[PDB]
């Protein structure tokens, strides 16, 4: 019937794609010259300088980089997860892949799948929709599609709804098992947006038959026209010998002000209340209590200077020197970078962060023009840098969780529209349980 559009889609939102993953995508691009390799990104949550460097390098590698916001694929639902301080990138990619495929067609792939064999110049899908029989379980990390395919469009709408209701997801039945073997985050991702969600949809849609179970698909029993290559053989195209499962702060959170973070939380909660009636106060309070080091790497433009931060000045010429400062009250105190070349160190200085930090700086190819990955690594070091010298330690004075919760409560419940839409508030904080009770009584008398 239809043909899979000649596009290969890869998604990496948040920080820059690791170089290992860039190499895999490059191979897919070289081995499949007839196909346009595209890496999808989100400019709203990405480090701008590093992203610009990446887009240029990808242009040199023959890889198209597209933004989800500019192409109209980021539904407000995906934007709600990406604007979270620690986003579940797995749920985001599981949702963006369906919207991207539905708008451009082509093949979605995970950057960990390697190309062993080039794809056919034309791939035909009797239903405009193909999956791989790899994994047993259902693989959602290889998906082929013709632009606008109805199945993909239905999945895209259904995943949105699943996500909206994610807070009512229970680890029951097949998920009860999986909670204990893989973890909570992982198991919930699979039920809400991943293969679990997908299985139920493909069952509901009749694409999978009576016999298939979530952990025993039985592809050999199914309609083979839904499978790449029209059979249950392992396709030649793919090969595989983690990232999204640990919750990491999205970029620059350490460099936002308390008030800006409060403001972001208030917007997200409003979304939650308006879509679900649920006020997950402690989720927000426990994100917002975390304050890692503020930091800036001095670029051509002059730096906005946060009190209590690190400022790193790159060198003028390649054989110039890096300089680091602890900014205290906009006063700049210069931390002594330990010499790493003369060696001649004492055993004390082996564990020293500053020495290890200097070593990292010395390994920059071009100190005047560092790569995105070099910038990324230095950033990462700065976020966690903790000298033995207490005088050069970032202080990171920050409100505790319960105070933050109190502030979020005041702001949300002072809005009469939101206040009246709240059905259920989650908080374990003793000072806030009676305020939640009071609102419950208020609602009870109307």
Are 155 and 161 in contact by the 8 Å Cβ rule? The answer is no
d(CA 105, CA 367): 42
Locate tokens 């082929």: which residue?
144
DSSP 390: G
Alpha-helical (H) ranges within 227-293 are 258-276, 281-288
> x/- binding map, residues 291-330, to Mg ion, per CB under 5 A?
----------------------------------------
Which range of residues in 52-60, 83-91, 336-344, 383-391 is near Mg ion by CB under 5 A?
Answer: 83-91
28 near Mg ion, judged by CB under 5 A: no
Options 89, 219, 238, 279; binder of Mg ion; rule CB under 5 A: 89
Structure tokens at 127: 């239903």
Stretch that binds Mg ion, among 86-94, 96-104, 121-129, 349-357 (CB under 5 A): 86-94
Residue 243 C-beta: closest distance to Mg ion, Å: 6
| Min CB(397)–Mg ion separation in Å | 32
- Residue 42 beta carbon to Mg ion: minimum distance, rounded to whole angstroms: 10
* Strand ranges (E), 328-395: 332-333
Name the strand (E) or helix (H) holding 227: none
What's the min distance (Å) between Cβ of 23 and Mg ion? 16
x/- mask, Mg ion, residues 170-209, rule CB under 5 A, reads: ----------------------------------------
Candidates 82-90, 120-128, 288-296, 356-364 — which segment interacts with Mg ion by CB under 5 A? 82-90
Number of residues located near Mg ion, criterion CB under 5 A: 1
By beta-carbon distance, which residue lies closest to Mg ion?
A: 89
The least CB distance from residue 87 to Mg ion, in Å, is 9
* Distance of alpha carbon 327 from alpha carbon 426, whole angstroms: 38
Residues 432 and 420: their CA atoms lie apart, in Å, by 18
101 SS3 class: helix
Of 183 and 320, which has the nearer Cβ to Mg ion? 183
- C-beta of residue 307 within 8 angstroms of C-beta of residue 255: no
The residue among 89 and 279 lying less far from Mg ion, judged by its C-beta, is: 89
- Contact positions with Mg ion (CB under 5 A) in 383-422: none
Bridge partner list, 65: 39
Q: Furthest-apart CA pair in the chain: how many Å?
A: 77
Closest approach, Cβ 37 to Mg ion, in A, equals 17
Question: 43 CB contacts (<8 Å, ≥6 apart)?
Answer: 51, 67, 69, 70
**Least distance CB 18 / Mg ion (angstroms):** 9
Where does residue 344 fall: left (phi above 0), alpha (psi -120 to 50 degrees), or beta otherwise?
Answer: left
Q: Which residues bind Mg ion (CB under 5 A)?
A: 89
């Amino acid at each position: 019937e239809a043909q899979i559009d000649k596009k290969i889609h890869f998604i990496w939102v948040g920080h820059i794609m690791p170089q290992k993953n860039i190499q895999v995508v490059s191979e897919w691009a070289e081995k499949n010259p007839g196909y346009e390799t595209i890496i999808w990104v989100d400019k709203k949550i990405a480090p701008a300088k590093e992203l610009d460097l990446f887009i240029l390098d990808m242009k040199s590698k023959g890889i198209t980089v597209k933004d989800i916001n500019e192409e109209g694929v980021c539904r407000d639902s995906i934007r709600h997860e990406l604007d979270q301080e620690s986003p579940n990138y797995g749920m985001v990619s599981d949702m963006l892949r369906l919207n991207i495929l539905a708008a451009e067609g082509g093949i979605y792939l995970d950057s960990d799948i390697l190309c062993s064999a080039p794809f056919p110049d034309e791939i035909y899908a009797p239903f405009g929709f193909l999956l791989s029989p790899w994994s047993n379980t259902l693989c959602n990390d290889i998906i082929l599609c013709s632009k606008g395919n109805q199945i993909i469009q239905q999945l895209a709408d259904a995943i949105e709804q699943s996500y909206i209701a994610r807070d009512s997801f229970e680890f029951t039945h097949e998920y009860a098992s999986m909670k204990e073997t893989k973890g909570e985050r992982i198991a919930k991702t699979l039920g809400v947006t991943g293969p679990g969600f997908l299985f139920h949809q493909l069952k509901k849609m009749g694409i999978l038959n009576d016999k298939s179970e979530m952990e025993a698909i039985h592809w050999e029993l199914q309609d083979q026209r839904y499978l790449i290559d029209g059979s249950v053989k392992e396709p030649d195209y793919f090969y595989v010998p983690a990232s999204w499962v640990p919750s990491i702060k999205r970029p620059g959170i350490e460099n936002m002000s308390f008030q800006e973070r409060l403001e972001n939380a208030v917007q997200l909660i409003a979304f939650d209340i308006q879509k679900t009636g649920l006020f997950n106060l402690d989720h927000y309070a426990n994100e917002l209590k975390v304050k890692q080091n503020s930091w800036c790497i001095a670029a051509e433009t002059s730096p906005e200077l946060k009190p209590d931060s690190y400022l790193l000045i790159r060198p003028r010429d390649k054989t110039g020197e890096w300089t680091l400062y602890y900014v205290d009250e906009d006063k700049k105190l210069n931390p002594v970078t330990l010499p790493v070349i003369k060696g001649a160190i004492k055993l004390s200085e082996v564990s020293d962060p500053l020495r290890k930090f200097h070593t990292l700086l010395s390994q920059v190819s071009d100190p005047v023009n560092p790569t995105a990955h070099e910038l990324k690594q230095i950033g990462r070091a700065l976020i966690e840098l903790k000298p033995r010298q207490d005088e050069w330690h970032c202080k990171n004075k920050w409100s505790g969780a319960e105070e933050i919760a109190q502030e979020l409560w005041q702001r949300i419940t002072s809005n009469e529209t939101l206040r009246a839409q709240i059905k259920q508030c989650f908080t374990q904080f003793e000072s806030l349980k009676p305020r939640v009770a009071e609102l419950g009584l208020e609602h009870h008398h109307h």
